[PDB]
Amino acid sequence: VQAVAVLKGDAGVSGVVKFEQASESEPTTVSYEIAGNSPNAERGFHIHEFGDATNGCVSAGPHFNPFKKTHGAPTDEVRHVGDMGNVKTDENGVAKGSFKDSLIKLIGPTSVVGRSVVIHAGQDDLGKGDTEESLKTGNAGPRPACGVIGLTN
Amino acid sequence: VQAVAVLKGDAGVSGVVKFEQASESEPTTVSYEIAGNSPNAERGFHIHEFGDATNGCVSAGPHFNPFKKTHGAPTDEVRHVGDMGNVKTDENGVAKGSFKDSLIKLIGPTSVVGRSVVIHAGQDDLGKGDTEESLKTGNAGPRPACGVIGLTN
Numbered sequence A, B: 001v002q003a004v005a006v007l008k009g010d011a012g013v014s015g016v017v018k019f020e021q022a023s024e025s026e027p028t029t030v031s032y033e034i035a036g037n038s039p040n041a042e043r044g045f046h047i048h049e050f051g052d053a054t055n056g057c058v059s060a061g062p063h064f065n066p067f068k069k070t071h072g073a074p075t076d077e078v079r080h081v082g083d084m085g086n087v088k089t090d091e092n093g094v095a096k097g098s099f100k101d102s103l104i105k106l107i108g109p110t111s112v113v114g115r116s117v118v119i120h121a122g123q124d125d126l127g128k129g130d131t132e133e134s135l136k137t138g139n140a141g142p143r144p145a146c147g148v149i150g151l152t153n
């Protein structure tokens, strides 16, 4: 199965994130190219629960977390399914890369098809900060762009 | 389950379409409000196969048609699952309404979550025209706006 989200917003950031998962047990490969960010920085990149764009990136809701865990890094055992950590931007403000993840899936009961991807304006502290906020969003700040994840071929 | 698609494009048409389906056998209720159309007209309103917005409304692909039928009216026995007929616009160019449909579903193998809704710039001839085109798209013309269908609460 393949899916894609086109990230848009009014803050100058935009980009495309592609997902591919051959079958249920295979991990999903996530590839992204996002431009217009601050340069040489780290920015929070998450999958949020709803694919509702009626109110900017606000209506995407909180991070996708069917197992009711606290926020963390992609490699922590305790994390939200939606937590993809930070993406690093180059000197031109572009973040480009790909990685594989075993919790995010396009098939089955926790599929993220129909949900949203959000790129934040701040760095995700990976749930290592000292507020209740760190344990919810990573204190990643505003949401300059987001897009609903749709099926593609 | 509830889902929503926010229709956007560069041609002045925009709108929101909400879907709700309580369970598998229940029909789905579709409610829409779309503005910026020509006034007092009929315009094709369909669900297309892919939720891919990387190329305008072009990458939405053709109508959603898992059963490989030809295009038709919502009430014909032979139609695409995606065929919702025409919506009528008022003197201000607004189309607003709701209806129930038993082929479109948000649950199960033919779910339309992750696919797209498209409002066209022309009238859908309901597969009653005389071209091979009528049997594919209803000869509904260009696609001024579209949106991916995402989950909501």
Ligand SMILES: [Cu+2]
Residues within 6 Å of the ligand: A044, A045, A046, A063, A118, A120, A137, A140
């Ligand atoms: Cu977030």
Ligand SMILES: [Cu+2]
Residues within 6 Å of the ligand: B044, B045, B046, B063, B118, B120, B137, B140
């Ligand atoms: Cu169409």
Ligand SMILES: [Zn+2]
Residues within 6 Å of the ligand: A046, A063, A070, A071, A072, A080, A082, A083, A136, A137, A138
């Ligand atoms: Zn999180």
Ligand SMILES: [Zn+2]
Residues within 6 Å of the ligand: B046, B063, B070, B071, B072, B080, B082, B083, B136, B137, B138
């Ligand atoms: Zn059709």
